[PDB]
Amino acid sequence: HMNSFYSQEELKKIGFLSVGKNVLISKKASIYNPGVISIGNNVRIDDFCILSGKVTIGSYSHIAAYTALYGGEVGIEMYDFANICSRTIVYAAIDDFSGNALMGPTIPNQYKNVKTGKVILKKHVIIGAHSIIFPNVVIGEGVAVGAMSMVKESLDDWYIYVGVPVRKIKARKRKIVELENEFLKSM
Amino acid sequence: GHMNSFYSQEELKKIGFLSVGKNVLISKKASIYNPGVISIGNNVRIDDFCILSGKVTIGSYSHIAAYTALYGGEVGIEMYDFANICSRTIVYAAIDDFSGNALMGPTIPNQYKNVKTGKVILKKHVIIGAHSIIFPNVVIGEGVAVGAMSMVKESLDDWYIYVGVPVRKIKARKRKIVELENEFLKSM
Amino acid sequence: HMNSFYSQEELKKIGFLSVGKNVLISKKASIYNPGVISIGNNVRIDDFCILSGKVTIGSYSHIAAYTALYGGEVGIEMYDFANICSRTIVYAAIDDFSGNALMGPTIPNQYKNVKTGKVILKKHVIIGAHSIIFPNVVIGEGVAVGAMSMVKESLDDWYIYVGVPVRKIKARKRKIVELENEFLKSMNS
Ligand SMILES: *SCCNC(=O)CCNC(=O)[C@H](O)C(C)(C)COP(=O)(O)OP(=O)(O)OC[C@H]1O[C@@H](n2cnc3c(N)ncnc32)[C@H](O)[C@@H]1OP(=O)(O)O
Ligand SMILES: *SCCNC(=O)CCNC(=O)[C@H](O)C(C)(C)COP(=O)(O)OP(=O)(O)OC[C@H]1O[C@@H](n2cnc3c(N)ncnc32)[C@H](O)[C@@H]1OP(=O)(O)O
Ligand SMILES: *SCCNC(=O)CCNC(=O)[C@H](O)C(C)(C)COP(=O)(O)OP(=O)(O)OC[C@H]1O[C@@H](n2cnc3c(N)ncnc32)[C@H](O)[C@@H]1OP(=O)(O)O
Ligand SMILES: Cc1cn([C@H]2C[C@H](O)[C@@H](COP(=O)(O)OP(=O)(O)O[C@H]3O[C@H](C)[C@@H](N)[C@H](O)[C@H]3O)O2)c(=O)[nH]c1=O
Ligand SMILES: Cc1cn([C@H]2C[C@H](O)[C@@H](COP(=O)(O)OP(=O)(O)O[C@H]3O[C@H](C)[C@@H](N)[C@H](O)[C@H]3O)O2)c(=O)[nH]c1=O
Ligand SMILES: Cc1cn([C@H]2C[C@H](O)[C@@H](COP(=O)(O)OP(=O)(O)O[C@H]3O[C@H](C)[C@@H](N)[C@H](O)[C@H]3O)O2)c(=O)[nH]c1=O
Ligand SMILES: [Cl-]
Secondary structure (H helix, E strand, C coil): CCCCECCHHHHHHCCCCEECCCEEEECCCEEECHHHEEECCCEEECCCCEEEEEEEECCCEEECCCCEEEEEEEEEEECCCCEECCCCEEECEECCCCCCCECCCCCCHHHECCEECCEEECCCCEECCCCEECCCCEECCCCEECCCCEECCCECCCEEEECCCCEEEEECCCHHHHHHHHHHHHC | CCCCCECCHHHHHHHCCCEECCCEEEECCCEEECHHHEEECCCEEECCCCEEEEEEEECCCEEECCCCEEEEEEEEEEECCCCEECCCCEEECEECCCCCCCCCCCCCCHHHCCCEECCEEECCCCEECCCCEECCCCEECCCCEECCCCEECCCECCCEEEECCCCEEEEECCCHHHHHHHHHHHHC | CCCCECCHHHHHHHCCCEECCCEEEECCCEEECHHHEEECCCEEECCCCEEEEEEEECCCEEECCCCEEEEEEEEEEECCCCEECCCCEEECEECCCCCCCECCCCCCHHHECCEECCEEECCCCEECCCCEECCCCEECCCCEECCCCEECCCECCCEEEECCCCEEEEECCCHHHHHHHHHHHHHHC
């Protein structure tokens, strides 16, 4: 009732492709295929998350509770200082909604029409709570997506976007760049 | 436990479903309440952190993705074959009156509430997009797709795509899947 | 496959600052720092709930499944007959989104700009499913917010609000206060 994280010792036994230091991962998260999951330094992953398939997270990243990263074979990668608020989903693959294909894991591949492509969250990206990131997009450096937003296309750097699907509403301030440098120097 | 969280077939048998078919993959991390009123057909996968509570009937060739709640209550939620539900969806067969005419929820005796109930049926080939909510007494017509983050309070016409809160019809669903279903069952 | 609630024996082992009678808490919920968590009578908290930090719940309240109450230091408080539909998040603190500050628990405080403020849900508040309430917000007595709502500012009493962010759409009926009084009167005589 203080925390649910793995000890450093249990972390080493998971079998991650790579795992940094100061990594706090909830025992109530699910991790599938850990040998294609890579995690940098100073990363917290909270209860009821799902990481499945190829996922790469850098350093100084919080993946908050309920967040699903479905990396599949193509991968999701997050750069340093990116953070995801609770209940986000990032899909690297999704079925065709149009009616031109059967759907999902109970059906053989030949009848489906999966949209897939690597998803990247660049440095300083923040994803607002209850958001969905669809496949084959890059969320630009310093981009903020508001809560309950839906993204289907790559997003231009250093803007804040809101809505379903998102629209640009204003520039993201770049003082965090200054602070990153100040912070890193301080160490 | 880093490959999958599903029950073995011998484990499923011990849950005590009204009926459960073959090639059924149900996460040990999902919750299942009143399994004696739940039935599940063949080739079904239900993922981590789902909840199925009360009367839920699922056919064959269906994925209920992670975090989905199917609150069937006493009236029931029914999905037909080839229906699927994306992550984080909720389907309610019963909900409390929000007007201010009634008290609300499970801590309150029934005489003070005014629960709206009605079966929710998803017909063949329905797909429900992620983070959606379906409310009681709604028939989601054959082949309907509902987009992500959509809210459905009324029945939806067959073979159309709907989006928004609450949903609006935006374009017809293609029906190539009907051929595909036939070609796939014919392969078997 | 009947229910996931802690027995009364298990509950007493949790360590709440205060917990009342007829408290039904899912063992599949997460409770962090129960020492600052107070719960009244006739409360139900479902599977995959998270309660973390300073949370005070009154009586006749259902916290439905997936709901997360991040009370932090400043606290989240719910008055009696308040209820929260599934998959809501209530934040008593959040990071600055603007780009003026670094973010999240991996960064020291001096580089962040956290907004914080007590969040209060008054009597008879209902929060629709899949909603978010932000910090420093008082949800007025009898307020309903609809499904998928986002609330960043305090809400005036006895109205229904919907949308992201919410707008006031209609009055909420007050018959519920007459029912509260009827209900409580029957418990007494
Ligand atoms: S990690 C903990 C989780 N934190 C969060 O999820 C925080 C998310 N914050 C937000 O979604 C904010 O609302 C942001 C995106 C930061 C915008 O806040 P601002 O204060 O910068 O802007 P306004 O509130 O003035 O709104 C600007 C226009 O955008 C609409 N809008 C704001 N937020 C959203 C969301 N999330 N979804 C849809 N629309 C949103 C406002 O209605 C406003 O629209 P106009 O058309 O200009 O009125
Ligand atoms: S099972 C794993 C999870 N998969 C999903 O949740 C997939 C959900 N897919 C979608 O929500 C798509 O956006 C769908 C519904 C398939 C629509 O995509 P289309 O490519 O057919 O259409 P457009 O992107 O051109 O959009 C048409 C109009 O509808 C608005 N819109 C699209 N999607 C939504 C949602 N989910 N919610 C509200 N509105 C939505 C677009 O803004 C566009 O609007 P106009 O007003 O016509 O410009
Ligand atoms: S605890 C179990 C979970 N229960 C719930 O989440 C129930 C939530 N209920 C709702 O969200 C209802 O839609 C409420 C808010 C009670 C409104 O229902 P009403 O029947 O009173 O109102 P209408 O359907 O006539 O809608 C009024 C206007 O509001 C728009 N709207 C309704 N609901 C929403 C939500 N959730 N989000 C955004 N907008 C919403 C309708 O489109 C309508 O708009 P107009 O511009 O007036 O047409
Ligand atoms: C959400 C969640 C929390 N926890 C545990 C570990 C966390 O350290 C603890 C608190 O997490 P939280 O997200 O509720 O709060 P945090 O946002 O970490 O903030 C906390 O630490 C800060 C440095 C202080 N400034 C805050 O006042 C204190 O609330 O609970 C888990 O173990 N798993 C979880 O999923
Ligand atoms: C989401 C989830 C996943 N898992 C386990 C079992 C799954 O078989 C495995 C991966 O599931 P997933 O949803 O991440 O991915 P799937 O949609 O099953 O897809 C995967 O298999 C396919 C046949 C291949 N075509 C894909 O490239 C590979 O990603 O993880 C669970 O045990 N429980 C879960 O809730
Ligand atoms: C959502 C959830 C349910 N459960 C268990 C406990 C509950 O008694 C049971 C059913 O809960 P539910 O939320 O599906 O349904 P309820 O809203 O409790 O409704 C039901 O029970 C009432 C006493 C009756 N008055 C109703 O007619 C019957 O449908 O499942 C859990 O143990 N944990 C959970 O998170
Ligand atoms: Cl969730």
